[PDB]
Structure 1
């Protein structure tokens, strides 16, 4: 099966899925390889080829450091790249239903990884189930991460910042230009992403250059107002300068720093990324989105507050235990291989790990809010995970949702509270960050895969809600006497819970905690 695109012909492959067929185009190029003089620059448009480009396997993932904390452990290693790393990584994937759809709604996935890691080729991002079951087209792209994606010297087109966000945007344009040839509708495009991919989705809502490149947006565990999501101009300069220093690239002409940096081996850039900050945390985002005056015209908090964003429906959600994953990457007394009962003093040390440049009064105030017990051995263990999850993910998603909904548009908020029966991490970690993704992509619809029946049904329903959101702007499941998902409004603040037992309409998720993070904490 060959499809003609604006730039040339591409050949896909056929896949058998659930007694049916999906056509996959894995590894289509969508920009000039950002090599040599192009390193650190905005992606450049691709020139046409003749002959048939073979899109029959996943392409290279972008250069990135890897999680080596737990070698041989599936819980961590499932997130590591499963394709060669290369600066030559600007590729995308298309999954289309078979037979070819006529005008299918398009779902475009943006992976997370803290803007430092990730790739579109992970097993948990495999778009074939969605294409099979919902007759949507799924698109996913690789975008540059780390310094190669986000090194910033404000205004300097040699290293303008946000390059990885421009990679995402050029791929959204590729879909606008090319997806009708695959039977897709460019006027019915939903972005969806998780963590940094969700924060990325939220920034496309703010970027004028992305306005016309999509219809609706889904934000899983992330948004651009999360404390890790946007690098200040101040931090970004300092970090670019530290990178320069660490690589023998300290200069006077700023364009001489970049020219020098362009001569370094990709691997020398990667090795030095960790150290550009004096004290990092497990949630460090050394190189991330900045206000560059191009993709992002002003501090995004100001844009959100004042209603300067694309007016459309949003679907937003978080997981019950967002913060737990992070505790075993540096918090004292924690371990994936025991129940991690910590003491008051370990808790206090843990705050120091997660809030390194925060005043002592700042830290005691967290302690004060989070240690008024209602004792129980796991009090402290549980509080630290909640601290981390509320501050970094839940309260920001909830605030993003209130502020966005205040300008008129329908918003839907979910609280995912199901722990995978296959989860390789311990029980105390609960409903972890990243672990709704496999339900969204329909992995439990595969009966061979060892999930329970209740999980198949949960996945089926979520897949239907996401597809209905995408096609119709309303994440209902209308056929099986399902709980109706109410609009989230800043007054009532209704949200839907997602779980195998009984799905509920509830109100004001984390009301007390978020008042602390959102109103008070930003003052310290």
Structure 2
């Protein structure tokens, strides 16, 4: 099938899904390749073409270091790019129902990866199931990551910072100007993403330039107020310079960029890892910064003072968000044994996750998380919760609380089902990033998951779809639990699992009081 867009014609491909058919347009360019003099600069508008652009395969993934901690292991390799890496990577994908819809709601996915990795061609981000089952149009895009996408030199158009965020924004603009041609409704666009993707979504809720580019937002395990989500102006500076020295580019800050623009992508990727003296396993070396363009002030200030797009949001986290990072630096941990660690190892673990923190700061963490209720796995579980609560759960809850205080309906979920096919060991539980497959409906495919998981995925897909279409995450036909709005007082949230869905209140009340009130002082 051939669709006519503002920049030219594009041909897609037909896909057979669940006895039906979906039309996919993989790899549509949405900006001039950020190459040469364009490296480090904001994305430039694309040059219109003649003839038909074949959008029948995923495009290149942006340059990024790859996870090599477990060669041959599907647990980690499933997140690695499955497409050739290249600086020429500003492309997006579109999955539309068949027959062509007339005014369908649009779901725009923004992948996570700590702003350093990720790509939209991953198997778990395939939008064809949603396009098929819910008749929504699914869009996803690749955006620059790492130094190539977030190198910051505030005020300098050569390397202003947040380039990756601008790529996402330019992609959202593309949908505004072109989605109607694919039978989509530019007035009904819901953004959703996980981890850094979620933090990205939350930042679009704060960026004036993105206000008119979408309707609603879904944030899975992430928000800009997460401690790893925004790079301080000081950090950015010390990192841009450290990268300069490491590539023999130290200089006129503008000449520094000119020098870096001659370096080979690999030389840059190779040195990104040492810009931080003692980084944590989250390793967000180059991320969003208050640039004065995309972000006009410290996000915490904007959130606190109600300066953001007023709309409905759906926010949530997984039960064991932190476990996954333990095997990437925490001493005594391993995906090949029960990882029963000691108090001493736990203490060294804190050193790893809280590098620049005072000794008293770490002791307070120990004090708060070690009042045992003896059990050999006490420290193993405490460290996991420490990492999860500090980096994801508490920041997500705080964001939800503050956001809803300004009148908008908000819904919060607590994902507690561990995939029956999870490659990681049992002690890691309901891991970070493993609810994604349920949202994209992979379990709907019987060729693979238990019956219970198929049903769970179906319910989630319906709730996510209803939220996108109507701003209300309900499943109204199968006598399902009603999802209550989250309010600052009651703080009700919904648990998602195979057993039975429940309405609970004040998730991690004691732990977040610690991370949100006390800790920020030390």
Q: Following the alignment from structure 1 to structure 2, what is the Cα–Cα distance between the partners of residues 405 and 496?
A: 16
Aligned residue for 1:15, secondary structure, equals strand
- 1:479 Cα shift? 0.1
Q: Give the whole-Å Cα distance in 1 for the aligned partners of 2:509 and 2:120.
A: 35
For 1:47 and 1:349, how far apart are their aligned partners in 2?
A: 53
* 1:408-429 Cα shifts (integer Å, max 9, x gaps): 0000000000000000000000
**Residues 366-411 of structure 1, C-alpha deviation per residue, up to 9 Å, x if partnerless?**
0000000111110000000000000000000000000000000000
Partner in structure 2 of residue 211 of structure 1: 211
Per-residue deviation, residues 96-148 of structure 1 (Å, max 9, x unmatched): 00000000000000000000000000000000000000000000000000000
Deviations 1:161-197 (A, max 9, x none): 0000000000000000000000000000000000000
| 2:504 matched residue in structure 1 | 506
Whole-Å separation in 1 of the counterparts to 2:512 and 2:283: 21
Q: CA deviation at 1:271?
A: 0.2
> 2:376 & 2:410 partners in 1: Cα distance?
39
1:470 is matched with which residue? 468
Partner of 1:377: 376
1:233 CA drift (Å)? 0.5
2:456 counterpart SS class: helix
Q: How does 1:344-363 map to 2 (within 5 A)?
A: 344-363=343-362
What is the alpha-carbon distance in structure 1 between the residues aligned to residue 375 and residue 202 of structure 2? 39
- Deviations 1:178-233 (Å, cap 9, x if unpaired)? 00000000000000000000000000000000000000000000000000000000
Q: Offset at 1:308? A: 0.1
> What CA deviation, in whole Å up to 9, does each residue of 1:224-259 have, x standing for no partner?
0000000000000110000000000000x1000000
| Alignment match, 1:265 | 264
Rounded Cα–Cα distance in structure 2 between residues aligned with 1:166 and 1:485: 34
Are residue 232 (structure 1) and residue 219 (structure 2) matched? no
Q: CA shift at 1:284, angstroms? A: 1.8
- 1:10-51 CA-partner distances (Å, limit 9, x unpaired): 000000000000000000000000000000000000010010
Q: Equivalents in 1 of 2:464, 2:55: separation in Å?
A: 27
Match of 1:414, SS state, is strand
TM-aligned CA deviation for residue 347 of structure 1: 0.3
Distance in structure 1 (CA, Å) of the matches to 2:225 and 2:385: 18
Q: SS where residue 519 of structure 2 aligns?
A: helix
Q: Distance in 2 between matches of 1:234 and 1:5?
A: 43
Helix, strand or coil at the partner of 1:275: coil
Aligned residue for 1:522, secondary structure, equals coil
Distance in 2 (alpha carbons) for counterparts of 1:48 and 1:88: 17
Matched with 2:133 is 133
C-alpha separation between the residues in 1 aligned to 2:3 and 2:515?
Answer: 50
SS of the residue corresponding to residue 85 of structure 2 reads coil
CA distance in 1, matches of 2:168, 2:308: 18
**Which residue of structure 1 aligns with residue 420 of structure 2?**
421
What does residue 66 of structure 1 align with?
Answer: 66
SS at match of 1:140: strand
Q: What secondary structure, in the 3-state scheme, does the structure 1 residue paired with 2:348 have? A: helix
- The 5 Å alignment of 1:34-49 reads 34-49=34-49
1:253-277 deviation per Cα after TM superposition (whole angstroms, max 9, x unaligned): 1000000000000000000001001
Aligned counterparts of 1:216 and 1:336: Cα–Cα separation in 2: 38
Give secondary structure in 2 for the equivalent of 1:27.
strand
Separation in structure 1 between the aligned mates of residue 180 and residue 284 of structure 2, nearest angstrom: 37
Deviation at 1:313, TM superposition (A): 0.1
Alpha-carbon distance in 1 for matches of 2:208, 2:414: 30
Aligned to 2:24: 24
CA separation in 2, counterparts of 1:237 and 1:261?
15
SS of the residue 2:329 aligns to: coil
Instruction: Describe the SS at the equivalent of 1:26.
Output: strand
- CA offset at residue 516 of structure 1? 0.2
Supply the distance in 2 between the matched residues of 1:34 and 1:311 (Cα, whole angstroms).
Answer: 33
- Distance in 1 between the 2:519 and 2:118 partners? 31
CA RMSD of aligned residues (A): 0.3
TM-score, structure 1 length as denominator? Answer: 1.00
Write the distance in 2 (CA, Å) between the matches of 1:47 and 1:519. 51
Instruction: Provide the rounded CA distance (Å) in 2 between the counterparts of 1:175 and 1:24.
Output: 15
Please give the alpha-carbon distance, in whole angstroms, between the structure 2 residues aligned to 1:26 and 1:312: 30
> Matched residues in 1 for 2:331 and 2:21: separation?
50
SS in 2 for 1:482: coil
**Aligned pair count?**
522
Aligned equivalents of 2:490 and 2:508: distance in 1?
A: 13
3-state SS of 2:23 partner: strand
